[PDB]
């Protein structure tokens, strides 16, 4: 076939019922995640080829960067609750990997302040039970799928994207193959 299990994707031995349609995992410490976000715009090109009715989810993970890694997962929950993902994603990536100006929770907070989220609003979110359960969901989703590596994408709790099995000579071709694979798996 043109799409083969074990080539552009793998199948989970243990399917996850009720899982989000398109579920992506990343870490602000993750070098390919930086690429996926800033150079390849994976999330956005996938969306562009997904059908109508398809929700996309993106979660942060704890297993990179120790204590700061966890802070970043709580901060992403804050970002999701406030709907400000698209204002903080780039500065968080660059602060962690490019300028290395993010070293503490206070520095993460500065990124949100500079993006125009108010102090009061951020700290209340940070401390809220709504953000606590949002952190819980991120963790449970990762735990559900054996997650020990990022970037990762899972389709319908059943299929896992395998970017290692796609050409990387050309970044535009890589992205289209990736998105087309998601679409194919979507329709599966």
Q: Which domains does the chain have, with CATH numbers?
A: 1-188 (3.40.30.10)
Q: Helices 119-127 and 105-114 meet at what angle, rounded to 10?
A: 130
Per 3-state DSSP, the chain is made up of helix, strand and coil in percentages (nearest 5) of: 55, 10, 35
Strands of the chain (E only): list them: 9-11, 22-26, 56-60, 152-155, 159-161
**Nearest of 150, 155, 172, 166 to residue 3 by alpha carbon:** 166
Radius of gyration of the chain (CA): 17
Return the structure tokens found at 7: 């080539």
Task: Please report, for the chain, how many H helices and E strands are present, in that order.
Answer: 8, 5
Residue with tokens 């709907």: 83
Contact 9, 166 (CB under 8 A): no
Question: Facing residues of 148 across strands?
Answer: none
Sign of CA dihedral 12, 21, 167, 147: negative
**Is the backbone of residue 156 left (phi > 0), alpha (psi -120 to 50) or beta?**
left
Q: How was this one solved?
A: X-ray
Contacts (Cβ under 8 Å, ≥6 apart) of 185: 9, 155, 156, 159, 161
């Amino acid at each position: 076939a043109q799409y083969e299990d074990g080539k552009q994707y793998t199948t989970l031995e243990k399917p996850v019922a009720g899982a989000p349609q398109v579920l992506e995992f990343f870490s602000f410490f993750c070098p390919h995640c930086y690429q996926f976000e800033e150079v390849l715009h994976i999330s956005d090109n996938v969306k562009k080829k997904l059908p109508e009715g398809v929700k996309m989810t993106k979660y942060h993970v704890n297993f990179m960067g120790g204590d700061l890694g966890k802070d970043l997962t709580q901060a992403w929950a804050v970002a999701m609750a406030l709907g400000v993902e698209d204002k903080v994603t780039v500065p968080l990536f660059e602060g962690v990997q490019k300028t290395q100006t993010i070293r503490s929770a206070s520095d993460i907070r500065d990124v949100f302040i500079n993006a125009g989220i108010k102090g009061e609003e951020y700290d209340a979110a940070w401390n809220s039970f709504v953000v606590k359960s949002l952190v819980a969901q991120q963790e449970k989703a990762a735990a559900d799928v054996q997650l020990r590596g990022v970037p990762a994408m899972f389709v319908n709790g059943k299929y896992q994207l395998n970017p290692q099995g796609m050409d990387t000579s050309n970044m535009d071709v890589f992205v289209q193959q990736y998105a087309d694979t998601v679409k194919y798996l979507s329709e599966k």
